Amino acid sequence: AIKKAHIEKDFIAFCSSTPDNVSWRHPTMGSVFIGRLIEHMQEYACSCDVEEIFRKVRFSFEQPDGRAQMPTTERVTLTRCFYLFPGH
């Protein structure tokens, strides 16, 4: 037979900035958001779910300086925690 499913579900978008605003990039060091995300994934993928890791990446941007940006999570439809379980 046929069963009904949600058309949109289990999504998470992580943007580099809040709407209306810029995201920065160093010419030899790449983008700040990307670099910060790699750093944080490398360090937190083992223990936290992706939602939490994104929150932590946001938290590292808390104190602004010469160049400011605030990463934003969008259109979340995750019904469960996504753990990467690196090494598994």
Binding site: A13, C15, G30, Y44, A45, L78
Partner: protein
């Protein structure tokens, strides 16, 4: 040790892995057998543009992200300097890849110039917009268009401006 497949990504011990399945029960996305599973990732990066300035340093982002997603166990597809039409075609194709059926999750990564409305294709200018909307990516990856990835996390990452403003206000300390 960081010479292994996971590289600089910190490993999750079996003690910690089963203690995570204790804090939350069946509220965690199921993970497939490491043996059989065919995990896919896709990075689209625009560095060379027709009119708008060159994204010097995007290579370090491609390197970094590709290596990271591979560490997490994904087969990283890298695509470069595409139009909004070209990106749709590639997103359409990624949505049709058979490996998703034997996968548990996916990662989409977009790195390009961006405006308030969306992500810039290689041929973008103010007179002739070449823009991929956030809406388009989700639409193309949902249950209607990507049934293989039903009930499975799809992680979209976007590196881009979302407008021109610096995103700051002043206040007295």
């Amino acid at each position: 040790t960081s010479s292994g497949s996971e590289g600089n990504v910190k490993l999750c011990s079996l003690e910690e892995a089963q203690r995570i399945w204790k804090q939350k029960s069946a509220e965690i996305y199921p993970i497939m057998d490491k043996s059989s599973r065919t995990r896919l990732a896709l990075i689209i990066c625009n560095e060379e543009f027709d009119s708008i300035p060159r994204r010097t340093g995007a290579e370090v982002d491609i390197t970094g992200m590709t290596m990271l997603l591979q560490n997490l166990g994904y087969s990283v597809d890298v695509k470069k300097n595409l139009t909004a039409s070209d990106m749709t075609t590639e997103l359409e194709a990624f949505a049709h890849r058979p490996e998703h059926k034997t996968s548990d999750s996916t990662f989409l990564v977009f790195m390009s110039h961006g405006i308030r409305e969306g992500i810039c294709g290689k041929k973008h200018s103010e007179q002739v917009p070449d823009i991929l909307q956030l809406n388009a990516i989700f639409n193309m990856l949902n249950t209607k268009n990507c049934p293989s990835l039903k009930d499975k996390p799809k992680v979209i990452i976007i590196q881009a401006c979302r407008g021109d403003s610096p995103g700051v206000v002043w206040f007295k300390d």
